[PDB]
Amino acid sequence: MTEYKLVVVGAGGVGKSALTIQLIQNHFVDEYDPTIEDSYRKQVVIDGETCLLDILDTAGQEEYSAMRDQYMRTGEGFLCVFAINNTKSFEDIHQYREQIKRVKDSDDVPMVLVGNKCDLAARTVESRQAQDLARSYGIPYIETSAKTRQGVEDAFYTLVREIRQH
Numbered sequence: 259m260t261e262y263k264l265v266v267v268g269a270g271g272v273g274k275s276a277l278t279i280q281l282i283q284n285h286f287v288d289e290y291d292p293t294i295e296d297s298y299r300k301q302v303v304i305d306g307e308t309c310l311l312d313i314l315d316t317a318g319q320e321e322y323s324a325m326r327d328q329y330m331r332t333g334e335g336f337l338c339v340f341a342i343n344n345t346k347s348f349e350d351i352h353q354y355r356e357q358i359k360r361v362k363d364s365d366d367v368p369m370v371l372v373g374n375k376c377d378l379a380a381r382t383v384e385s386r387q388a389q390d391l392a393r394s395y396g397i398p399y400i401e402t403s404a405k406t407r408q409g410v411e412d413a414f415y416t417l418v419r420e421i422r423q424h
């Protein structure tokens with residue numbers, strides 16, 4: 259079976275862990291525990307292929323972002339996450355993308371842009387704005403909620419499909 263090495267990156271609090279944990283363990287994490295670096299592994303069937311997802315959940319806080327560069331180097335695809343109720347996290351995305359380009363030493367890295375927390379009504383980032391950004395990078399935009407499960411499978415699976423196009 260093929261292994262896919264997925265990396266989840268973005269600002270602190272945007273819901274990286276919650277998204278990952280919702281995909282792998284099928285429940286919502288209500289509390290906020292800042293992440294250092296954790297991995298998860300699940301065998302899944304995606305478009306007929308049995309594959310091993312290896313997911314690295316990275317830190318978003320400056321204080322906890324110690325070995326992040328080194329860990330991200332082996333990533334085959336990256337989930338770039340912001341929260342639709344946090345404009346600064348959307349503004350920060352470019353910096354995460356620049357870091358992926360450094361760490362992979364390449365212009366062409368499989369990525370998906372993710373607007374998380376789409377269950378909340380306090381939207382400051384409109385879909386159209388995220389779509390444009392994603393369009394400039396040549397990647398898709400998917401909105402997700404880790405709370406309701408909406409788009410969660412779709413976002414990670416799309417990322418596998420992006421890696422397959424590489």
Ligand SMILES: Nc1nc2c(ncn2[C@@H]2O[C@H](COP(=O)(O)OP(=O)(O)NP(=O)(O)O)[C@@H](O)[C@H]2O)c(=O)[nH]1
Binds near residue numbers: 374375
């Ligand atoms: N309503 C809602 N809340 C969410 C969602 N995703 C995450 N949260 C909430 O936001 C907080 C932070 O989520 P978490 O996954 O820890 O964020 P993170 O990106 O892994 N934080 P860090 O970068 O510090 O590791 C948690 O209290 C969590 O319940 C979502 O889709 N909807």
Ligand SMILES: [Ca+2]
Binds near residue numbers: 286287288
């Ligand atoms: Ca819970």
Ligand SMILES: [Ca+2]
Binds near residue numbers: 345346
């Ligand atoms: Ca602001």
Ligand SMILES: [Ca+2]
Binds near residue numbers: 382
């Ligand atoms: Ca606005």
Ligand SMILES: [Mg+2]
Binds near residue numbers: 275276291293315318
């Ligand atoms: Mg986390």
